[PDB]
A paper describes a structure:
We determined the crystal structure of KpOptS, which was refined at a nominal resolution of 1.75 Å. Minimal conformational and B-factor variation was observed across the protomers and superposition showed root mean square deviation (r.m.s.d.) values of roughly 0.3–0.4 Å, on average, between pairs. A second interface connecting the two dimers has around 500 Å2 of buried surface area. It is not clear if this second interface is sufficient to determine whether the tetrameric complex represents a true species or whether it is a feature of crystallization. Although KpOptS is a small protein (about 14 kDa) on the basis of primary amino acid sequence alone, size-exclusion chromatography supported the existence of a larger molecular weight species in solution (greater than a dimer). Although different in quaternary structure and domain architecture, the protomeric unit of KpOptS aligns well with the palm domains of Cas10 (Csm1) from Thermococcus onnurineus and the GGDEF diguanylate cyclase PleD from Caulobacter crescentus (r.m.s.d. values of 3.86 Å and 2.39 Å, respectively)30,31. GGDEF proteins are defined by a conserved linear sequence motif (glycine–glycine–[aspartate/glutamate]–[aspartate/glutamate]–phenylalanine) that is nearly absent from the mCpol proteins Kp and VnOptS, yet they still retain the characteristic β-hairpin structure and positioning of an acidic residue into the active site.
[name] constitutively synthesizes 2′,3′-c-di-AMP and other cyclic dinucleotides to hold OptE in an inactive state. During phage infection, Acb2 or similar immune evasion proteins are produced that sequester the [name]-derived signalling molecule, leading to a population of OptE that is no longer bound to cyclic dinucleotide and is free to become activated, in turn disrupting the bacterial membrane and resulting in phage defence.
Residue numbers in the entry:
A (entry chain A), C (entry chain D): 0 to 118
B (entry chain C), D (entry chain B): 0 to 119
The structure:
Amino acid sequence: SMYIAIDGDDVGRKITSSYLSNSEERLTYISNKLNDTTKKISKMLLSNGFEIIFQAADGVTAKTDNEVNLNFVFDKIKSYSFDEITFSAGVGANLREAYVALLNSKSNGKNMISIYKDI
Amino acid sequence: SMYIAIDGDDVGRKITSSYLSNSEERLTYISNKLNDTTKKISKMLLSNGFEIIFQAADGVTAKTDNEVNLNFVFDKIKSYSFDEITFSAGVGANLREAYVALLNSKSNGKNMISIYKDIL
Amino acid sequence: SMYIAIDGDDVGRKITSSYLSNSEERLTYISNKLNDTTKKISKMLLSNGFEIIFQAADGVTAKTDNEVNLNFVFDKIKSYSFDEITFSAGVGANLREAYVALLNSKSNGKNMISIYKDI
Amino acid sequence: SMYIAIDGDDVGRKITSSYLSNSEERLTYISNKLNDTTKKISKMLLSNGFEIIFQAADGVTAKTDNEVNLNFVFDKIKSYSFDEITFSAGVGANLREAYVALLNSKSNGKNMISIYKDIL
């Protein structure tokens, strides 16, 4: 039983920047692109045997009982980046482990995946 | 012209709590209610002549040139609370003011609305 | 071997409020009360046999190999609350457990302590 | 009167990394380095005729009514960087302007300074 928690890297900084510069068009662009990119993530996960647990904009969490190629899955997630917006991931054997692994990725960089047992 | 920025209060803490307690049911519940609540927010704003600028996760930002009763709009916002999750808002004459007024609401309480001009 | 991580609750919110209201005196009061209270916590942990690992801003992290009464230690921490500013704590057998327990406290309330093995 | 708000960039991420990797030495190193650096920042501001309003770790805010070379002041701030930790700044005519300028710096880059009037 494997869990994956996926979240955008510092998307809040890009949103705040758009508010402070009065950039309506950039804010609407981010809104639309976050919605479209998290749909691509969820459908890819579904096509690879996952069950979607949580799906907001910039955040998707899922689980599977099948074996998966995490390199392939995270390569797909990396290919869904747009502009200076990327996503990180944590993998674990329950929700808490995937969440802590996700914090590990976020605290050590961007556009990376961590597996809890390997920390 | 008037801009309004709306966001949930402490939603991230409820989500974090769900991960650390291994509560899939509560996490999925939060996901569904957030998405349903922000759909209700966007539809109420569009119904009062707003153009939606941003709609993602727990935030909705919009603008209008129509006349607007803010008491009506924010009483509607307050009716969309669920469990321990409330929503705050900031209003201004541009996006920057609405954002700063939202930060004012978040920093001074829960379930409240701030007009940028009243903060000066 | 026991680790404890202590951090203020929502202190950033009180600070942001003071900036946005141009409340110079309020901000300076928070600065002083924060540094004074964290020194109080640090001296208290030393008096109960801890070694300080980290002490900065609104947080103190310490470890001990000696015997401890946790109820006495955290009741002391709660007695260091001022105005609406309080502190939460996490305890574990290593730094990661103490941190995750601290995150558990912060996400479920304020002025509370979590022991990692209890979660 | 000029207000300046200074804050470290990404300090919390370096701290979190240390907890999660069980690196006591790296966490104590950060603690010691942050405390050294905030004292250097505040002593430099005092040396330039500022009055300190707020001083925590990775964060110092001050104000002055005298003349100041901000370029010299921020050049000193940038020289206090250590490892991957840099500092950002906002300048304004009151606390709220300095804060919003600092938010502008942190959302738009690393190791930068913003003057509130330059953002309008």
